[PDB]
């Protein structure tokens, strides 16, 4: 009823019942497809984005929906609008980077850092990767398994600041 | 039928809470406001 009513603020009104009800998995998938089609509209970020918050309930509370959420945000991390300038595009990209860092904190670490490596080697400017490292080393607690270092540190070779980067590189090479 | 679920391995203990959960609390404030309505 909520999704086909074409909801924003009314979502925040009944967000209580939502995060109560996203615990149902099928309902989580349904809201995911709804917010995908709403947010996949060209220039849906110039007008309310609360919808990106809901993935936080989904991915955190449902492990097997980690692949979908990242595989949603891979599209949204490539958002480009001439109306919302490259500053606002980078703002949304950094927001999505914080979402992807949270999803990394839930254990979906190999494909996150692999795609981050791929888009840096491609698209994703060094500013976005530096902000990724900033948020990561601001949130991730040691020890750091080498399965994560093997992709995070050899792409962090480009920069040395966010100092936490020096601590991370020294700990993960020693 | 589809077999058991295996929880993911925790490579490290979280020294803090993610900012996502902080935003969940931030929006739970307006949730309580709607409860007041």
Tab-separated table of N, CA, C and O in Angstrom, chain B residues 2-29:
chain	number	residue	atom	x	y	z
B	2	UNK	N	15.382	-25.715	2.446
B	2	UNK	CA	16.510	-25.092	1.763
B	2	UNK	C	17.821	-25.181	2.538
B	2	UNK	O	18.821	-24.613	2.086
B	3	UNK	N	17.851	-25.866	3.681
B	3	UNK	CA	19.069	-26.062	4.429
B	3	UNK	C	19.289	-24.979	5.467
B	3	UNK	O	18.608	-23.949	5.475
B	4	UNK	N	20.251	-25.189	6.362
B	4	UNK	CA	20.455	-24.246	7.464
B	4	UNK	C	21.213	-23.001	7.023
B	4	UNK	O	21.912	-22.988	6.009
B	5	UNK	N	21.055	-21.944	7.819
B	5	UNK	CA	21.811	-20.711	7.641
B	5	UNK	C	23.064	-20.742	8.504
B	5	UNK	O	23.029	-21.185	9.656
B	6	UNK	N	24.171	-20.263	7.933
B	6	UNK	CA	25.450	-20.138	8.621
B	6	UNK	C	25.729	-18.657	8.850
B	6	UNK	O	25.807	-17.921	7.854
B	7	UNK	N	25.849	-18.144	10.078
B	7	UNK	CA	26.115	-16.719	10.237
B	7	UNK	C	27.499	-16.367	9.684
B	7	UNK	O	28.399	-17.220	9.680
B	8	UNK	N	27.685	-15.135	9.213
B	8	UNK	CA	29.009	-14.780	8.683
B	8	UNK	C	30.071	-14.748	9.770
B	8	UNK	O	29.797	-14.511	10.949
B	9	UNK	N	31.310	-14.991	9.347
B	9	UNK	CA	32.444	-14.873	10.257
B	9	UNK	C	32.669	-13.405	10.600
B	9	UNK	O	32.571	-12.521	9.736
B	10	UNK	N	32.962	-13.139	11.872
B	10	UNK	CA	33.291	-11.798	12.352
B	10	UNK	C	34.811	-11.699	12.415
B	10	UNK	O	35.446	-12.259	13.311
B	11	UNK	N	35.391	-10.975	11.455
B	11	UNK	CA	36.844	-10.869	11.380
B	11	UNK	C	37.414	-10.006	12.499
B	11	UNK	O	38.599	-10.134	12.822
B	12	UNK	N	36.600	-9.137	13.097
B	12	UNK	CA	37.058	-8.239	14.146
B	12	UNK	C	35.856	-7.799	14.965
B	12	UNK	O	34.741	-7.697	14.444
B	13	UNK	N	36.092	-7.537	16.246
B	13	UNK	CA	35.055	-6.978	17.097
B	13	UNK	C	34.916	-5.488	16.814
B	13	UNK	O	35.911	-4.769	16.679
B	14	UNK	N	33.671	-5.027	16.727
B	14	UNK	CA	33.392	-3.629	16.423
B	14	UNK	C	33.676	-2.777	17.653
B	14	UNK	O	33.027	-2.944	18.691
B	15	UNK	N	34.644	-1.862	17.543
B	15	UNK	CA	34.915	-0.952	18.651
B	15	UNK	C	33.847	0.126	18.803
B	15	UNK	O	33.830	0.810	19.833
B	16	UNK	N	32.968	0.293	17.818
B	16	UNK	CA	31.937	1.319	17.834
B	16	UNK	C	30.709	0.752	17.130
B	16	UNK	O	30.672	-0.428	16.769
B	17	UNK	N	29.705	1.603	16.935
B	17	UNK	CA	28.515	1.293	16.157
B	17	UNK	C	28.612	1.975	14.795
B	17	UNK	O	29.125	3.099	14.713
B	18	UNK	N	28.181	1.379	13.678
B	18	UNK	CA	28.259	2.101	12.402
B	18	UNK	C	27.348	3.317	12.387
B	18	UNK	O	26.336	3.376	13.091
B	19	UNK	N	27.722	4.297	11.561
B	19	UNK	CA	26.920	5.509	11.421
B	19	UNK	C	25.533	5.217	10.859
B	19	UNK	O	24.620	6.033	11.035
B	20	UNK	N	25.364	4.080	10.181
B	20	UNK	CA	24.040	3.657	9.738
B	20	UNK	C	23.091	3.486	10.921
B	20	UNK	O	21.957	3.974	10.896
B	21	UNK	N	23.539	2.786	11.967
B	21	UNK	CA	22.709	2.619	13.159
B	21	UNK	C	22.472	3.950	13.863
B	21	UNK	O	21.402	4.167	14.455
B	22	UNK	N	23.453	4.850	13.812
B	22	UNK	CA	23.244	6.193	14.337
B	22	UNK	C	22.119	6.895	13.590
B	22	UNK	O	21.268	7.547	14.204
B	23	UNK	N	22.084	6.751	12.263
B	23	UNK	CA	20.996	7.350	11.498
B	23	UNK	C	19.668	6.657	11.780
B	23	UNK	O	18.615	7.304	11.741
B	24	UNK	N	19.696	5.351	12.061
B	24	UNK	CA	18.478	4.658	12.475
B	24	UNK	C	17.917	5.271	13.753
B	24	UNK	O	16.706	5.479	13.870
B	25	UNK	N	18.787	5.575	14.718
B	25	UNK	CA	18.333	6.266	15.926
B	25	UNK	C	17.827	7.677	15.614
B	25	UNK	O	16.802	8.119	16.163
B	26	UNK	N	18.549	8.395	14.742
B	26	UNK	CA	18.152	9.749	14.358
B	26	UNK	C	16.749	9.768	13.775
B	26	UNK	O	15.971	10.692	14.036
B	27	UNK	N	16.416	8.765	12.965
B	27	UNK	CA	15.070	8.667	12.417
B	27	UNK	C	14.078	8.059	13.405
B	27	UNK	O	12.872	8.324	13.303
B	28	UNK	N	14.550	7.274	14.378
B	28	UNK	CA	13.669	6.824	15.447
B	28	UNK	C	13.169	7.984	16.296
B	28	UNK	O	12.119	7.859	16.937
B	29	UNK	N	13.895	9.103	16.322
B	29	UNK	CA	13.353	10.296	16.979
B	29	UNK	C	12.036	10.734	16.330
B	29	UNK	O	11.020	10.921	17.016
